[PDB]
Amino acid sequence: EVQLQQSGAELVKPGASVKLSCTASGFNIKDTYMHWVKQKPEQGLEWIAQIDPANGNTKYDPKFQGKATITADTSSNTAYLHLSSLTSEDSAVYYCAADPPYYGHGDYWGQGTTLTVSSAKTTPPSVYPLAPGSAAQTNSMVTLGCLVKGYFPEPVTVTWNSGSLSSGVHTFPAVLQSDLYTLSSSVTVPSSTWPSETVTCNVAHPASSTKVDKKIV
């Protein structure tokens, strides 16, 4: 397949810099134009810069001047994006794109490289169970939950009963509160079989190599 392969996810402290890469297979980048596009968390698309690898000529959106540097290496068939003096405003998914390299087909976009700029330290989440308090008068089904709080960085993996419970589950997008993330997950199961058949919330935080099993009681 023709495709653009980008380097892995980046987690960088503010004030630092980072160089992202994008390698083409199936065509030579010197035969087209390479671009980098930024998409801020939950936002639209912003063109950053363009480069013609055959001569190195570049174009930049004025607002990234002094921040972004695009370069390319035709021998490795790779385009690069350098970002300096990183700030939280730089946190975003960065895509490299190539104008259509062949007639009859469209353009190509890499899978994206997530860049997170934060000074926060790696922190494992505090996993708290959410069990019904009041007498609970919800006849056929019951909703339980889990609160995954104060962790960094993303992501955390949440499953119920080790992946066996997958229907009626709602794992909400994490929210940032003071450099640290917090998320919650709810699961609804027949009340006839709870708490007889235990419901456990399994939270995994890769970055801190933690895995907690909080049983709802």
Binding site: D107, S126, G145, L183
Partner: protein, 212 residues
């Protein structure tokens, strides 16, 4: 700097319904340089329509594009579930190249009242000196909803964190989670904790609370 404005920002369509969205440019652009991309959560934008009216590889015949100068549109003859996504128009006419703000297309379904559940802090959390009260408002439609936190007759604004899920792939509903966090002390200081949800499916609010 050729600004692209998309209308509407968000829009719902029942299955089978005809859909039209527009893209307007601050300055005229060649129709050969105006494109549309489709994006779904978690994946890269994908070329949908190139040069105003041509469908990209694999794009369904139900889609179409029209326009020139400063006015363009994308139309879907008949709405299908997998059409739900964000569509961005893009001008590759003059630098800086720009994208419109996007049109998020959602699926219209029958209204549905939220299933509300309130949860008290955990003893584990209380032992660490914190107290988060959580409220889930699940599977409702439409997405518009307001949640109020009340502690002992006082609306609590600060310290609330809300999170919404993407439209459900199975039932086209939305879900919300709201969390009110206080210190362990503030929490033991009050006894009535209420989560109030106002949704168009009902005049009176849905109320869920607990004591102590």
């Amino acid at each position: 700097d050729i600004v692209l404005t998309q209308s509407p920002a968000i829009m719902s369509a029942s299955l089978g319904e005809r859909v039209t969205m527009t893209c307007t440019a601050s300055s005229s652009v060649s129709s050969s340089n105006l494109h549309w991309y489709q994006q779904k959560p978690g994946s890269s934008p994908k070329l949908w329509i190139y040069s105003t009216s041509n469908l990209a590889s694999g794009v369904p015949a139900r889609f179409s594009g029209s326009g020139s100068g400063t006015s363009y549109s994308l139309t879907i003859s008949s709405m299908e579930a997998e059409d739900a996504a964000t569509y961005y128009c893009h001008q590759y006419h003059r630098s800086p190249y720009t994208f419109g703000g996007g049109t998020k297309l959602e699926i219209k379904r029958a209204d549905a009242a939220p299933t509300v559940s309130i949860f008290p802090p955990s003893s584990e959390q209380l032992t660490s000196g914190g107290a988060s009260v959580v409220c889930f408002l699940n599977n409702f439609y439409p997405k518009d909803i307001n949640v109020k936190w009340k502690i002992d007759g006082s609306e609590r604004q600060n310290g609330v964190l809300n999170s919404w899920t993407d439209q459900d792939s199975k039932d086209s509903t939305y879900s919300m989670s709201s969390t009110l966090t206080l210190t362990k002390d503030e929490y033991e200081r009050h006894n009535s904790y209420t989560c109030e949800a106002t949704h168009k499916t009902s005049t009176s609010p849905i109320v869920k609370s607990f004591n102590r």
